[PDB]
Write an enzyme that holds these catalytic residues in place. Structure first.
Site, PDB file in Angstrom:
ATOM      1  N   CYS A 141     -22.525  25.699 -84.337  1.00  0.00           N
ATOM      2  CA  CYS A 141     -23.115  26.578 -85.337  1.00  0.00           C
ATOM      3  C   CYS A 141     -23.751  25.647 -86.351  1.00  0.00           C
ATOM      4  O   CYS A 141     -23.112  24.703 -86.800  1.00  0.00           O
ATOM      5  CB  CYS A 141     -22.026  27.448 -85.980  1.00  0.00           C
ATOM      6  SG  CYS A 141     -22.317  27.937 -87.711  1.00  0.00           S
ATOM      7  N   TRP A 157     -10.712  22.462 -84.975  1.00  0.00           N
ATOM      8  CA  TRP A 157      -9.617  22.529 -85.939  1.00  0.00           C
ATOM      9  C   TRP A 157      -8.411  21.829 -85.389  1.00  0.00           C
ATOM     10  O   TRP A 157      -7.806  20.994 -86.043  1.00  0.00           O
ATOM     11  CB  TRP A 157      -9.243  23.982 -86.229  1.00  0.00           C
ATOM     12  CG  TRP A 157     -10.179  24.614 -87.168  1.00  0.00           C
ATOM     13  CD1 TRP A 157     -10.939  25.727 -86.953  1.00  0.00           C
ATOM     14  CD2 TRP A 157     -10.515  24.137 -88.466  1.00  0.00           C
ATOM     15  NE1 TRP A 157     -11.740  25.970 -88.047  1.00  0.00           N
ATOM     16  CE2 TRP A 157     -11.496  25.009 -88.992  1.00  0.00           C
ATOM     17  CE3 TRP A 157     -10.081  23.059 -89.240  1.00  0.00           C
ATOM     18  CZ2 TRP A 157     -12.052  24.835 -90.252  1.00  0.00           C
ATOM     19  CZ3 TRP A 157     -10.629  22.883 -90.489  1.00  0.00           C
ATOM     20  CH2 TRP A 157     -11.607  23.769 -90.989  1.00  0.00           C
ATOM     21  N   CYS A 213     -22.216  26.302 -90.137  1.00  0.00           N
ATOM     22  CA  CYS A 213     -20.802  25.933 -90.242  1.00  0.00           C
ATOM     23  C   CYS A 213     -20.731  24.409 -90.270  1.00  0.00           C
ATOM     24  O   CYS A 213     -19.931  23.821 -91.000  1.00  0.00           O
ATOM     25  CB  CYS A 213     -20.023  26.450 -89.042  1.00  0.00           C
ATOM     26  SG  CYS A 213     -20.457  28.136 -88.520  1.00  0.00           S
ATOM     27  N   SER A 273      -5.679  22.025 -94.215  1.00  0.00           N
ATOM     28  CA  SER A 273      -5.235  23.421 -94.241  1.00  0.00           C
ATOM     29  C   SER A 273      -5.957  24.267 -95.307  1.00  0.00           C
ATOM     30  O   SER A 273      -6.276  25.445 -95.077  1.00  0.00           O
ATOM     31  CB  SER A 273      -3.722  23.476 -94.471  1.00  0.00           C
ATOM     32  OG  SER A 273      -3.264  24.813 -94.417  1.00  0.00           O
TER      33      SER A 273
HETATM   34  C1  LIG Z   1     -15.722  22.866 -89.235  1.00  0.00           C
HETATM   35  C2  LIG Z   1     -15.651  24.342 -88.854  1.00  0.00           C
HETATM   36  C3  LIG Z   1     -16.473  25.151 -89.688  1.00  0.00           C
HETATM   37  C4  LIG Z   1     -16.477  26.537 -89.446  1.00  0.00           C
HETATM   38  N1  LIG Z   1     -17.231  27.385 -90.300  1.00  0.00           N
HETATM   39  C5  LIG Z   1     -17.333  28.802 -90.156  1.00  0.00           C
HETATM   40  C6  LIG Z   1     -18.103  29.588 -90.980  1.00  0.00           C
HETATM   41  O1  LIG Z   1     -18.754  29.137 -91.977  1.00  0.00           O
HETATM   42  N2  LIG Z   1     -18.158  30.971 -90.716  1.00  0.00           N
HETATM   43  C7  LIG Z   1     -17.502  31.646 -89.701  1.00  0.00           C
HETATM   44  O2  LIG Z   1     -17.536  32.847 -89.419  1.00  0.00           O
HETATM   45  N3  LIG Z   1     -16.742  30.802 -88.923  1.00  0.00           N
HETATM   46  C8  LIG Z   1     -16.631  29.446 -89.092  1.00  0.00           C
HETATM   47  N4  LIG Z   1     -15.840  28.596 -88.370  1.00  0.00           N
HETATM   48  C9  LIG Z   1     -14.890  29.278 -87.546  1.00  0.00           C
HETATM   49  C10 LIG Z   1     -13.535  29.705 -88.032  1.00  0.00           C
HETATM   50  O3  LIG Z   1     -12.944  28.578 -88.730  1.00  0.00           O
HETATM   51  C11 LIG Z   1     -12.604  30.223 -86.978  1.00  0.00           C
HETATM   52  O4  LIG Z   1     -12.229  29.265 -86.000  1.00  0.00           O
HETATM   53  C12 LIG Z   1     -12.942  31.584 -86.397  1.00  0.00           C
HETATM   54  O5  LIG Z   1     -13.293  32.627 -87.350  1.00  0.00           O
HETATM   55  C13 LIG Z   1     -12.211  32.137 -85.254  1.00  0.00           C
HETATM   56  O6  LIG Z   1     -10.879  32.353 -85.719  1.00  0.00           O
HETATM   57  P1  LIG Z   1      -9.589  32.314 -84.849  1.00  0.00           P
HETATM   58  O7  LIG Z   1      -8.692  33.350 -85.328  1.00  0.00           O
HETATM   59  O8  LIG Z   1      -9.947  32.166 -83.412  1.00  0.00           O
HETATM   60  O9  LIG Z   1      -8.911  30.912 -85.247  1.00  0.00           O
HETATM   61  P2  LIG Z   1      -8.677  30.175 -86.643  1.00  0.00           P
HETATM   62  O10 LIG Z   1      -8.391  31.292 -87.596  1.00  0.00           O
HETATM   63  O11 LIG Z   1      -9.535  28.982 -86.818  1.00  0.00           O
HETATM   64  O12 LIG Z   1      -7.320  29.597 -86.098  1.00  0.00           O
HETATM   65  C14 LIG Z   1      -7.048  28.330 -85.479  1.00  0.00           C
HETATM   66  C15 LIG Z   1      -5.550  28.295 -85.243  1.00  0.00           C
HETATM   67  O13 LIG Z   1      -5.164  27.577 -86.450  1.00  0.00           O
HETATM   68  C16 LIG Z   1      -4.289  28.412 -87.236  1.00  0.00           C
HETATM   69  N5  LIG Z   1      -4.830  28.454 -88.560  1.00  0.00           N
HETATM   70  C17 LIG Z   1      -5.800  29.280 -89.197  1.00  0.00           C
HETATM   71  N6  LIG Z   1      -6.071  29.047 -90.444  1.00  0.00           N
HETATM   72  C18 LIG Z   1      -5.195  28.010 -90.759  1.00  0.00           C
HETATM   73  C19 LIG Z   1      -4.916  27.247 -91.917  1.00  0.00           C
HETATM   74  N7  LIG Z   1      -5.610  27.426 -93.051  1.00  0.00           N
HETATM   75  N8  LIG Z   1      -3.906  26.304 -91.902  1.00  0.00           N
HETATM   76  C20 LIG Z   1      -3.144  25.982 -90.821  1.00  0.00           C
HETATM   77  N9  LIG Z   1      -3.476  26.706 -89.660  1.00  0.00           N
HETATM   78  C21 LIG Z   1      -4.491  27.703 -89.683  1.00  0.00           C
HETATM   79  C22 LIG Z   1      -4.132  29.762 -86.524  1.00  0.00           C
HETATM   80  O14 LIG Z   1      -2.817  30.222 -86.574  1.00  0.00           O
HETATM   81  C23 LIG Z   1      -4.558  29.474 -85.152  1.00  0.00           C
HETATM   82  O15 LIG Z   1      -3.497  28.912 -84.369  1.00  0.00           O
HETATM   83  C24 LIG Z   1     -15.702  27.124 -88.325  1.00  0.00           C
HETATM   84  C25 LIG Z   1     -14.991  26.217 -87.498  1.00  0.00           C
HETATM   85  C26 LIG Z   1     -14.938  24.841 -87.726  1.00  0.00           C
HETATM   86  C27 LIG Z   1     -14.138  24.079 -86.685  1.00  0.00           C
END
Ligand SMILES: Cc1cc2nc3c(=O)[nH]c(=O)nc-3n(C[C@H](O)[C@H](O)[C@H](O)COP(=O)(O)OP(=O)(O)OC[C@H]3O[C@@H](n4cnc5c(N)ncnc54)[C@H](O)[C@@H]3O)c2cc1C
Ligand SMILES: CCN1C(=O)CCC1=O
Length: 351
Positions: free
Chosen positions: A279, A127, A282, A155
């Site tokens: 994954c 991300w 994903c 986003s």
């Molecule tokens: C391409 C991709 C596909 C994925 N698909 C899945 C899936 O199908 N199922 C599953 O369980 N997990 C999936 N994931 C994982 C998921 O997106 C998260 O990274 C995860 O659940 C762990 O969350 P987290 O709180 O560590 O970070 P995330 O919630 O990813 O946070 C990343 C960081 O970005 C920020 N952030 C979060 N959401 C946003 C937003 N919308 N806009 C701007 N900033 C944001 C947060 O503040 C934090 O700093 C995927 C990841 C990628 C890279």
């Protein structure tokens, strides 16, 4: 604000879209077997150690093997069929039916986008990269806007996934897939803009679909299986019509000519990084949803300053591959928009 309208549009359209996205035509997507992640070379930090590739939500150790991320985010063999020329996915719409005289197919309806447990630092970095490769050539006429558009897009795509993983969460206790209001709030809920960006995306992908409708060729009448399919798609695209479509959501009329392609680059170059997603499920949707937006953009940037003869080439000569991506993406967007409401209620009946 303009929300409410899309919520109605989304409601009078959800039933039919789902039935469409289940059709044989749209139920399969072509996915590359071997994944080449060009980023784990001259190392930057990409963590591959399983400890940093899992969302620390559930306490995985305290769970069974068949519930570990490794399994939750894996396809179901039995479904994925062989990919050859039979899946005309490579053909152009204008060449599916006669006007005159290294990979496989993943059954999409069978591998729905849901909570897989995938996350952790690995996912965080992915991300993080996408958000960072938002840097077009400055000085260009539109420099700023291009990024506010790009960023906004990603986003939403980001929230889109988050929403989906909350509506389809796994009750580590009962073992029933059910909605998780708390998690939905932690990721989306308590961040107004994130919910707004999903709406943003919905309006883009919807306006993209709308724009081409008038040009969709008679691509499905000849296929004995998916006859209705072309017409059944027109039907949908129509109920979409809105006043919002008058906005230039993606700054087509304000962006530079060279600048535009650059915007398209970031995307085929995001849809690429999607191979660094360990994954399997994903990766699948990250590759569909991303190709989706990339296509939505191509559509909007070109139908813009184009005449009729041009709007012909463009739409007609657009691959079935892209049309699945597009509609399929609009499918995710359609459900994310709705799971939001379905959650405001869940949140409502809180006290
Ligand atoms: C391409 C991709 C596909 C994925 N698909 C899945 C899936 O199908 N199922 C599953 O369980 N997990 C999936 N994931 C994982 C998921 O997106 C998260 O990274 C995860 O659940 C762990 O969350 P987290 O709180 O560590 O970070 P995330 O919630 O990813 O946070 C990343 C960081 O970005 C920020 N952030 C979060 N959401 C946003 C937003 N919308 N806009 C701007 N900033 C944001 C947060 O503040 C934090 O700093 C995927 C990841 C990628 C890279
Ligand atoms: C540091 C900001 N930036 C990027 O994120 C890539 C290109 C650039 O200058």
């Amino acid at each position: 604000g303009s929300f409410n309208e899309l919520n109605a549009i989304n409601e009078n359209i959800r039933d039919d879209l789902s039935a469409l996205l289940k059709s044989d035509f749209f139920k399969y997507f072509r996915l590359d077997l071997y994944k080449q992640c060009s980023f784990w070379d001259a190392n930057d930090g990409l963590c591959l150690n399983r400890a940093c590739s899992v969302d620390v939500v559930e306490d995985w150790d305290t769970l069974p093997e068949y519930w570990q991320p490794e399994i939750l985010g894996s396809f179901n063999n039995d479904t994925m069929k062989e990919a050859d020329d039979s899946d005309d996915e490579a053909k152009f719409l204008d060449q599916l039916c006669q006007t005159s005289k290294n990979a496989v197919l993943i059954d999409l309806t069978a591998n729905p986008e849901r909570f897989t447990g995938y996350g952790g630092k690995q996912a965080g970095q992915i991300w993080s990269t996408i958000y960072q490769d938002n840097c077009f050539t400055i000085g260009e006429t539109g420099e700023s806007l291009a990024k506010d558009a790009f960023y906004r897009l990603v986003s939403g795509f980001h929230a889109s996934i988050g929403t989906h993983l909350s509506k389809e969460y796994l009750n580590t206790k009962t073992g029933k897939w059910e909605p998780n209001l708390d998690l939905f709030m932690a990721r989306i809920g308590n961040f107004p803009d994130r919910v707004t960006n999903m709406y943003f995306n919905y309006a883009v992908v919807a306006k993209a679909l709308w724009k081409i409708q008038p040009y969709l060729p008679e691509f499905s009448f000849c296929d004995l299986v998916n006859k209705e399919i072309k017409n059944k798609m027109d039907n949908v695209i129509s109920q979409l019509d809105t006043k919002i479509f008058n906005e230039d959501l993606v700054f087509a009329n304000d962006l530079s000519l060279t600048l535009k392609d650059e915007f398209r680059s970031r995307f085929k170059n995001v849809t690429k990084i999607m191979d660094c997603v360990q994954c399997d499920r994903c990766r699948l949707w990250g590759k569909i949803q991303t190709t989706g937006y990339a296509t939505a953009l191509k559509i909007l940037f070109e139908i813009n300053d184009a005449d009729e003869f041009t709007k012909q080439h463009i739409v007609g000569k657009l691959t079935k591959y892209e049309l699945i991506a597009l509609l399929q993406t609009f499918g995710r967007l359609s459900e994310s928009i709705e799971s939001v409401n379905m959650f405001e209620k869940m949140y409502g009946k809180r006290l």
